[PDB]
């Protein structure tokens, strides 16, 4: 989210995320007002369940085109640069970045495909730069009549209106597989108490009782303790061993 430069929309980056802990609340500090549309999952309950892999796609698009990044949408960026599947789950986060990706002379490093023979299957990249023959005469690589170069540049300028200023877009995609889930958010904690009847949780173990200093000696890998009657009687504190 804090990278200096994002890739062009047609050559959009692909980032894989696994075996990590993510705190999405910080994502609310990007802009005073920004889009946080989430599909198939409530944003406020992203810190409870977790998935096997996360896919992040980041790029920059014109502001008024931001509505084209959604399932079932149609247009030009939707079908020629980046297409989302109809059965898509995840989130899309787009915010204004006029203070970072605007040149007084005009930015030209951001490119988008304009002409394509057919539409784009969801999650597909097309980096081809071969000339597009609009008509029937094969120009064989010259930008004359009925032959247009498929890539055009957003001449971003700070003097433009809000409808044309650049906007940074990051798409998060989640999924479930038979592989065990690994990307789970933080779980918080609370200070310990001793010699008092309290309700306690230990690594997903509910309980109620009095915690006292223990004389039992677990093995290094041992976590729980069970008595004759097959009930929990000894526990190991996950933070301090």
């Amino acid at each position: 989210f804090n990278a200096t430069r994002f890739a062009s929309v047609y050559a959009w980056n692909r980032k894989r995320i696994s075996n990590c802990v993510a705190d999405y609340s910080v994502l609310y500090n990007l802009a005073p007002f920004f889009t946080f549309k989430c599909y198939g999952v409530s944003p406020t309950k992203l810190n409870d369940l977790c998935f096997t892999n996360v896919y992040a796609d980041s790029f920059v698009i014109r502001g008024d085109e931001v509505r084209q990044i959604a399932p079932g949408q149609t247009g030009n960026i939707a079908d020629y640069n980046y297409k989302l599947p109809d059965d898509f789950t995840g989130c899309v986060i787009a915010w204004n970045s006029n203070k970072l990706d605007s040149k007084v002379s005009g930015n030209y490093n951001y490119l988008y495909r304009l002409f394509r023979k057919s539409n784009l299957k969801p999650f597909e990249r097309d980096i081809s730069t071969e000339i597009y023959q609009a008509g029937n005469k094969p120009c064989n690589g010259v930008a004359g009549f009925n032959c247009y170069f498929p890539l055009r540049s957003y001449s971003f300028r700070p003097t433009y209106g809000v409808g044309h200023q650049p906007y940074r877009v990051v798409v998060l995609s989640f999924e479930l597989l038979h592989a065990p889930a690994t990307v789970c958010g933080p779980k918080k904690s609370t200070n310990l108490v001793k010699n008092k009847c309290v309700n306690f949780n230990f690594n997903g173990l509910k309980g109620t009782g009095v915690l006292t200093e223990s004389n039992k000696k677990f093995l290094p890998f041992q976590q729980f303790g069970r008595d004759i009657a097959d009930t929990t009687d000894a526990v190991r504190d996950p933070q301090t061993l």
């Epitope: 200096t4 430069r5 970072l100 040149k103 007084v104 030209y108 170069f149």
Partner: antibody
Amino acid sequence: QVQLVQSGAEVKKPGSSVKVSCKASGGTFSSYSFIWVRQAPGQGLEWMGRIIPILGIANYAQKFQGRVTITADKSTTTAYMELSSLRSEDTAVYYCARGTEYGDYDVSHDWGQGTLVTVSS
Amino acid sequence: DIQMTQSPSTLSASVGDRVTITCRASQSISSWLAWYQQKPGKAPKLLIYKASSLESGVPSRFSGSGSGTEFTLTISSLQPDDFATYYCQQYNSYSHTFGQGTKLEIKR
């Protein structure tokens, strides 16, 4: 990665025009842009012009209208500058520098060795 | 046009020393600025673009820091190959201006 080669040093009377070539070798050429920058012996740097041939945008310095024009050839994958109305103070060395789409066009990732152009009688 | 200058014009440094060069423009140029080193007699090589990014192959010791209208390039541990001419260039708006040229030298 990409080798930049310029022309040689040239001596010419001020009443003429000079054409200077710059060839870049390495990677795809269609994603590159060319700037021409000057180096005078008695002071520092001054930029003149930037060219994006694949997108076809030309931008020359405010003090260089009608005097220098820079074009690019796709078949030879080269760049050329022609400068007219040579003045006595215009004796100095030229650097052809190259910018990449991956990054920024204005910045110059690679540089040429330069051409020493001189005018006298 | 943006008129910009760097300080100091000439700085004397030694091997292993930490030094800094400042570069200030007339008005705000956002964060569009690049740094270049020139050994006397050859072409310059870019070091920092966007005033923060480190080029591939450029040693990480060189540090750039700046937001707009003031920028600094700092060297923590200097080596005898760091004595050269340092040049700024802003690329906000057309007519890209350059720097005067700061010479780094040893103490005689």
